[PDB]
Design an enzyme around this catalytic site. Sequence first.
Site, PDB file in Angstrom:
ATOM      1  N   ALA C  99       8.844   1.399   5.537  1.00 22.94           N
ATOM      2  CA  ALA C  99       8.940  -0.054   5.593  1.00 22.94           C
ATOM      3  C   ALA C  99      10.128  -0.594   4.799  1.00 22.94           C
ATOM      4  CB  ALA C  99       7.649  -0.680   5.086  1.00 22.94           C
ATOM      5  N   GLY C 143       5.858  -1.652  -2.771  1.00 23.83           N
ATOM      6  CA  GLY C 143       6.333  -0.948  -1.596  1.00 23.83           C
ATOM      7  C   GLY C 143       6.141  -1.758  -0.330  1.00 23.83           C
ATOM      8  N   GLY C 144       6.913  -1.432   0.703  1.00 19.53           N
ATOM      9  CA  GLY C 144       6.796  -2.108   1.982  1.00 19.53           C
ATOM     10  C   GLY C 144       5.522  -1.705   2.700  1.00 19.53           C
ATOM     11  N   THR C 145       5.165  -0.430   2.578  1.00 21.97           N
ATOM     12  CA  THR C 145       3.936   0.089   3.162  1.00 21.97           C
ATOM     13  C   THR C 145       2.740  -0.319   2.306  1.00 21.97           C
ATOM     14  OG1 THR C 145       5.046   1.988   4.193  1.00 21.97           O
ATOM     15  CG2 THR C 145       2.674   2.178   3.838  1.00 21.97           C
ATOM     16  N   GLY C 146       2.830  -0.039   1.007  1.00 23.71           N
ATOM     17  CA  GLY C 146       1.777  -0.387   0.070  1.00 23.71           C
ATOM     18  C   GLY C 146       1.380  -1.850   0.140  1.00 23.71           C
ATOM     19  N   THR C 179      11.559   0.517  -7.660  1.00 21.92           N
ATOM     20  CA  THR C 179      12.608   0.978  -6.755  1.00 21.92           C
ATOM     21  C   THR C 179      13.188  -0.140  -5.887  1.00 21.92           C
ATOM     22  OG1 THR C 179      10.745   1.779  -5.408  1.00 21.92           O
ATOM     23  CG2 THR C 179      12.084   3.434  -6.538  1.00 21.92           C
ATOM     24  N   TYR C 224       6.155   9.802 -12.606  1.00 19.11           N
ATOM     25  CA  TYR C 224       4.981   9.410 -11.837  1.00 19.11           C
ATOM     26  C   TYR C 224       3.839  10.388 -12.085  1.00 19.11           C
ATOM     27  CZ  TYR C 224       7.642   5.937  -9.158  1.00 19.11           C
ATOM     28  OH  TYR C 224       8.391   4.848  -8.780  1.00 19.11           O
ATOM     29  N   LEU C 252     -21.161  -0.128  -4.435  1.00 15.29           N
ATOM     30  CA  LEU C 252     -19.989  -0.999  -4.468  1.00 15.29           C
ATOM     31  C   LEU C 252     -20.355  -2.469  -4.644  1.00 15.29           C
ATOM     32  CD1 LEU C 252     -17.688   0.517  -1.680  1.00 15.29           C
ATOM     33  CD2 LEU C 252     -17.638   0.942  -4.142  1.00 15.29           C
ATOM     34  N   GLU C 254     -22.562  -3.631  -6.487  1.00 19.86           N
ATOM     35  CA  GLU C 254     -22.884  -3.882  -7.887  1.00 19.86           C
ATOM     36  C   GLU C 254     -21.633  -4.175  -8.713  1.00 19.86           C
ATOM     37  OE1 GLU C 254     -25.527  -0.875  -9.539  1.00 19.86           O
ATOM     38  OE2 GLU C 254     -25.529  -1.970 -11.444  1.00 19.86           O
TER      39      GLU C 254
HETATM   40  N1  LIG Z   1       2.061   4.608 -10.901  1.00 22.78           N
HETATM   41  C1  LIG Z   1       2.766   4.970  -9.832  1.00 22.78           C
HETATM   42  N2  LIG Z   1       3.578   4.050  -9.207  1.00 22.78           N
HETATM   43  C2  LIG Z   1       4.298   4.413  -8.121  1.00 22.78           C
HETATM   44  C3  LIG Z   1       4.232   5.705  -7.621  1.00 22.78           C
HETATM   45  N3  LIG Z   1       5.046   5.775  -6.544  1.00 22.78           N
HETATM   46  C4  LIG Z   1       5.620   4.564  -6.352  1.00 22.78           C
HETATM   47  N4  LIG Z   1       5.171   3.718  -7.332  1.00 22.78           N
HETATM   48  C5  LIG Z   1       5.510   2.298  -7.501  1.00 22.78           C
HETATM   49  O1  LIG Z   1       5.357   1.665  -6.246  1.00 22.78           O
HETATM   50  C6  LIG Z   1       6.396   0.730  -6.028  1.00 22.78           C
HETATM   51  C7  LIG Z   1       7.150   1.105  -4.758  1.00 22.78           C
HETATM   52  O2  LIG Z   1       6.217   1.235  -3.710  1.00 22.78           O
HETATM   53  P1  LIG Z   1       5.961   2.621  -2.930  1.00 22.78           P
HETATM   54  O3  LIG Z   1       4.496   2.989  -2.932  1.00 22.78           O
HETATM   55  O4  LIG Z   1       6.806   3.741  -3.489  1.00 22.78           O
HETATM   56  O5  LIG Z   1       6.518   2.293  -1.452  1.00 22.78           O
HETATM   57  P2  LIG Z   1       5.662   2.522  -0.112  1.00 22.78           P
HETATM   58  O6  LIG Z   1       4.224   2.095  -0.292  1.00 22.78           O
HETATM   59  O7  LIG Z   1       5.755   3.966   0.317  1.00 22.78           O
HETATM   60  O8  LIG Z   1       6.388   1.526   0.929  1.00 22.78           O
HETATM   61  P3  LIG Z   1       7.798   1.859   1.645  1.00 22.78           P
HETATM   62  O9  LIG Z   1       8.407   3.117   1.074  1.00 22.78           O
HETATM   63  O10 LIG Z   1       8.730   0.688   1.463  1.00 22.78           O
HETATM   64  O11 LIG Z   1       7.517   2.047   3.115  1.00 22.78           O
HETATM   65  C8  LIG Z   1       7.288   0.762  -7.254  1.00 22.78           C
HETATM   66  O12 LIG Z   1       6.956  -0.322  -8.091  1.00 22.78           O
HETATM   67  C9  LIG Z   1       6.958   2.081  -7.915  1.00 22.78           C
HETATM   68  O13 LIG Z   1       7.133   2.035  -9.312  1.00 22.78           O
HETATM   69  C10 LIG Z   1       3.416   6.637  -8.245  1.00 22.78           C
HETATM   70  O14 LIG Z   1       3.347   7.788  -7.814  1.00 22.78           O
HETATM   71  N5  LIG Z   1       2.685   6.258  -9.353  1.00 22.78           N
END
Ligand SMILES: Nc1nc2c(ncn2[C@@H]2O[C@H](COP(=O)(O)OP(=O)(O)OP(=O)(O)O)[C@@H](O)[C@H]2O)c(=O)[nH]1
Lengths: 54, 427, 437, 347
Positions: C99, C143-146, C179, C224, C252, C254
């Site tokens: 994403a 993240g874009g996906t997250g 990132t 990480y 859940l 609760e």
């Molecule tokens: N605590 C922790 N944070 C993480 C980790 N990996 C990524 N992050 C955090 O997540 C954010 C970036 O989102 P990601 O999860 O890497 O991106 P994604 O969900 O894969 O989305 P896209 O790559 O854009 O498709 C940043 O703020 C990172 O610091 C991890 O393994 N542990």
Amino acid sequence: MEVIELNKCTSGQSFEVILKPPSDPSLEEIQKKLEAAEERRKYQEAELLKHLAE
Amino acid sequence: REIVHIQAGQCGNQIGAKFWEVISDEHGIDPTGSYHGDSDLQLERINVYYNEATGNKYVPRAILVDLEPGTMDSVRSGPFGQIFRPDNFVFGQSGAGNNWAKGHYTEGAELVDSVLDVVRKESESCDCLQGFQLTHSLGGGTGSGMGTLLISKIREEYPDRIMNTFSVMPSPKVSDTVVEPYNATLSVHQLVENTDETYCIDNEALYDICFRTLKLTTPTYGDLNHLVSATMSGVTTCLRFPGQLNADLRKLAVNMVPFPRLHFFMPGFAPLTSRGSQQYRALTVPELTQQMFDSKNMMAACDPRHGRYLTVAAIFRGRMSMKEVDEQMLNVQNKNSSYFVEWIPNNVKTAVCDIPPRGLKMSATFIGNSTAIQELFKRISEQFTAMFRRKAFLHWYTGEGMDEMEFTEAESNMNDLVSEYQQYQDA
Amino acid sequence: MRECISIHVGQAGVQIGNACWELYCLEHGIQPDGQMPSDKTIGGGDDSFNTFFSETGAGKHVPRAVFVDLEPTVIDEVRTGTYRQLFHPEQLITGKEDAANNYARGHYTIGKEIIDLVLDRIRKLADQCTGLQGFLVFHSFGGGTGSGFTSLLMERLSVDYGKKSKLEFSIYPAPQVSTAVVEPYNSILTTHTTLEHSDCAFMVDNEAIYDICRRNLDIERPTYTNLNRLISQIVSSITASLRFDGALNVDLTEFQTNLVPYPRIHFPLATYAPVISAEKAYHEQLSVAEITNACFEPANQMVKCDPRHGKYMACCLLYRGDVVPKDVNAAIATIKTKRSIQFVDWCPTGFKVGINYQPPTVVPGGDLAKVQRAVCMLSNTTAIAEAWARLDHKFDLMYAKRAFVHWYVGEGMEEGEFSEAREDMAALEKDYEEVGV
Amino acid sequence: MYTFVVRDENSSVYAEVSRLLLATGQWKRLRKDNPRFNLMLGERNRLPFGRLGHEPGLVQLVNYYRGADKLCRKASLVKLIKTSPELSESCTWFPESYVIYPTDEREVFLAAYNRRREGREGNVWIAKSSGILISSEASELLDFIDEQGQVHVIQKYLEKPLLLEPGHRKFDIRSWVLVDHLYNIYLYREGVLRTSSEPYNSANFQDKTCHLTNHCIQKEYSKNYGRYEEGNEMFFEEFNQYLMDALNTTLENSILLQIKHIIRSCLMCIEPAISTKHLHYQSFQLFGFDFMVDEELKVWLIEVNGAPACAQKLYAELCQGIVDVAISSVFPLATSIFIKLHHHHHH
Ligand SMILES: Nc1nc2c(ncn2[C@@H]2O[C@H](COP(=O)(O)OP(=O)(O)OP(=O)(O)O)[C@@H](O)[C@H]2O)c(=O)[nH]1
Ligand SMILES: *[C@H]1[C@@H](C)[C@H]2[C@@H]([C@H](O)[C@H]3[C@H]4[C@H]([C@H](OC(C)=O)[C@H](OC(C)=O)[C@@]32C)[C@]2(C)[C@H](C[C@@H]3O[C@@H]3[C@@H]2OC(C)=O)C(=O)[C@@H]4O)[C@]2(C)[C@@]1(O)OC(=O)[C@@]2(C)O
Ligand SMILES: Nc1ncnc2c1ncn2[C@@H]1O[C@H](COP(=O)(O)OP(=O)(O)CP(=O)(O)O)[C@@H](O)[C@H]1O
Ligand SMILES: Nc1nc2c(ncn2[C@@H]2O[C@H](COP(=O)(O)OP(=O)(O)O)[C@@H](O)[C@H]2O)c(=O)[nH]1
Ligand SMILES: [Ca+2]
Ligand SMILES: [Mg+2]
Ligand SMILES: [Mg+2]
């Protein structure tokens, strides 16, 4: 001070201690949003290809 | 996640060839295309720039383009000349005579479909093509005129892929012809619309680095190109080795480009050490960091203190303290915070790669989106106007079917670009 | 027994997922191949650990988990990792390109393409459940996906599983490991869209975890891996009640009942102690009083904020190891006289306490030392709103100039969604203030 | 070089601190909203404490204690003393006070008001808020508060004040107190008596010129402003000499012991609620304690001001002192004017 709901088992226990007492979008609607976004992307690309055609 | 490389014209193919020599060495690929390295870290993302061929060979995903065969014959006979796919040499005979119109409208128009066929063949062998990178000059005819033609065509056929360029800006200080400001203005007009990321490599800066810093009284184009290929290696490290930051072309763009037209970057490199006794001197992380931000280490002849940074990407290479890198990067921002726009929080991102470049134990490459870049375009604009005022040398272009209006339009858009930088410099 | 399905979205969600399931296996005595010698009921059962693990006829214990990422390289490490035998291929879903740190790209463009496939794979797990409780969703804000795909997934889960609870474990962005510059945009966009679909969300600020690792584990520059193993310990403490015998937070529903009286205000603060370096040569073991007192120190919280300048709506203490109620109650009595603890007028001032006699399990070779007792406090305090304030401020700075907005509009998102999301956050900050001051 | 931001333009104290910081050449003032600062000289209202201490590579310090407002608001102070066992309802150095809202301790106040009058003892009271009314009648006081439409406090009026001679004049003592990031409590050795120029008149509880000692009120309604001393400001050297000549005692013994006791008691009480000892950002703050002295030389606390100005004569020294112990202590540059208040009695 007041301890209540004390429960015990082999793995542990739980309880509560009280110090003092007191005083959605449908599937179709979701589908609509996603398709409306796709249409806007589609329109944007069409405008680009027209511009390039010129 | 494949990238397709294109190099157009004399400058484009000469820096391009140097780029492939440098990163081939880094990835452990010899001129035959055989891997002879001692680290799987070299091969983990080698798919980005290389196709794997029969015999377990590695072939650059590179297309070599020119309207005359001269330079590409020299590439073919060069050090790593054999590594390139012979079918990817696409060339004419007529040349472009330092004429943007010839490259864009007449001579190049005749050759462009042949190039696109090769682009398509390469793109079809990609699991998931992320985009394109073009190397060219803006001052000539082929790289400038035909290069921007190609970019336009590629965007038409691949409108959802990233377009990246390494664009060499002309300078009277290092010049071949007087019409370079015309060719450059016409090209910038194209780049503003049809690229996502453009690395502005100023020949003025490359010369001044060679002369002032590196103490070379008489730099050749070859010596200018060592700086470029070293810088190119640095700015693409995140794409070529495992990492978190700017690991692909789109994520870099999202981090570096707050407004679509303002996608012209100042690259920088460190260390830049003159030969002598101090060439063996050990460099510390604080020294690297200070030098990478130094204007004398920038590859675009612009004063960073004359503008503000919208975004910055920094990439350190070699064995070093990650903690120290973080501390020094924070020091720069906190000690010079006024030069970083406050309306883009945390706009400096840092990466660290274990693999250093050849001949250095550690290095740092700088990528800045600064509003100071307006000085570069203002220079070209002034040089453009001095001639265009009197319609000087215009017959070279009108003879190829171009009208004066197209020059006026190109100039106006580049002047709009300048004022857009000034807007955010004052915001 | 009632099942729980875990869903891990994006890099952060997946990698944190890896750490949690590794730890779960160690806690339950499940081997990397899925075998569990202590499980005498072969090929089935309704024990408490079956909430998170199904069983095959051959005695394999398989996580009720789905991993989804729009790009394959992180989940590929799961596919070839030490616990590759644990998961069935259909549990691991990957796309081709990600994403690009763009909420709109994850939610609209790529999300539309893959959402139905994900729901099918989730449906497969749900079909194996006799009494599905709901979902635990792991993802980043940045993240874009997250951010993007998660909010779409949450919306659809409310449609397809309307009666089921949904819990979040969410990674709040911190510049020290982030990132992308646009992570504040993504955070507020996903929070706005997810808010009505989440029953309880545990927010983890990478800033806090990063500094705890530097300060208490003597790690100069945490990775990480360092961050995730610490996070997994906290997550395990929170989910232990679902996986072991007990009478507190056993389902859940609760969690919502005990921690979330106001639905929108559903972000409990987690505080954990003790965090001790495994390299610490001499360590004096901490008492119930000492670890409990540490739960009111901001330096130990998952989000840096100041609960003294807010109000509590609820507070749970989750102990693991050598702990008895008498020592807990004595600890609380003295802490209340020394510290500033203020509950809202419409909630009782008190603590729900859970104890599990088994001390924390640590990953062999990890950073954390074994301790005799540990505690995780879950408190719903208005002070966590400090995190929304910080985020909304960064949002405002960039959006006032429309910086980076074209990236989102280019994916088909309307610019109006930015301000709608921001307005929802402004309301949320107002809600917290009304309750807390 | 250290960096700081200025977010309260109307502060005379910290305008001077800002001037002093810049003059060192080792401090730089950033724009109002540049987050990359070491020091924040913050706004008085809705200071964004939640955004402090989240900048890697920067130790951050602010010139206000979050939560200190409990001490520095009229109604909050009464509640704090009344509900804190450190201070308690039977507190000897705070006048009997009650919190009253418009249309709450109204009914409790009237119970006290009665036997006050039904016991052959004075029964004058004063009503105020952060618009002041001194009266002998309860109904006049309660009526006034509702007509104002604001949260108010009703306080026992000190009918037997210490009166300076010549003039038979009323006064109040302002003490400036600096609490640093370590919660060291520093009392500025220079206080000031803000004096009335009109004779005290127990017969008429108007003529605020003789009942209210505010520096501004004396300037407007008093015909004798500046008569006995410049600006109606008597400083400690003169006042001490007066106490020696007139009452055969010292400022230290008769008054300052009590003042130091009250200051320390107040600030140690709220220390757990506001201390930044283990916080991700640090706080210091300058307070202004106002005191009344009765004719028995007993000191009474009147209010605490969280954003005090200074006497013109004392700005230079105090502001420099703030730079020294509060700022340079955290950010060292490349005999003391304060009395450190500490006491550890064993019992
Ligand atoms: N605590 C922790 N944070 C993480 C980790 N990996 C990524 N992050 C955090 O997540 C954010 C970036 O989102 P990601 O999860 O890497 O991106 P994604 O969900 O894969 O989305 P896209 O790559 O854009 O498709 C940043 O703020 C990172 O610091 C991890 O393994 N542990
Ligand atoms: C021009 C000549 C200036 C080039 C030379 C070498 O290939 C270059 C080496 C390079 C030299 O850098 C100096 C002099 O400080 C220099 O390249 C420059 C100045 O751009 C040389 C001699 C070296 C020594 C590099 C190793 C190490 O990285 C240090 C330095 O490069 C940098 C980053 O400063 C090399 O060993 C290079 O081989 C030639 C042959 C030149 O004569 O004509 C060229 O085409 C050239 C650049 O390759
Ligand atoms: N209980 C009391 N008994 C006698 N006099 C009192 C009193 N309360 C207040 N005063 C007088 O009234 C004056 C003003 O009271 P108050 O303290 O409310 O004003 P203020 O809030 O402006 C002081 P500051 O400017 O320092 O904040 C005091 O200086 C004192 O002269
Ligand atoms: N750095 C560098 N610049 C070059 C080189 N060759 C040409 N240029 C610059 O490119 C411009 C001429 O363009 P060129 O590439 O020779 O024309 P083309 O072959 O038609 O594309 C001028 O501004 C030159 O200064 C080179 O080898 N290195
Ligand atoms: Ca079983
Ligand atoms: Mg040429
Ligand atoms: Mg990802």
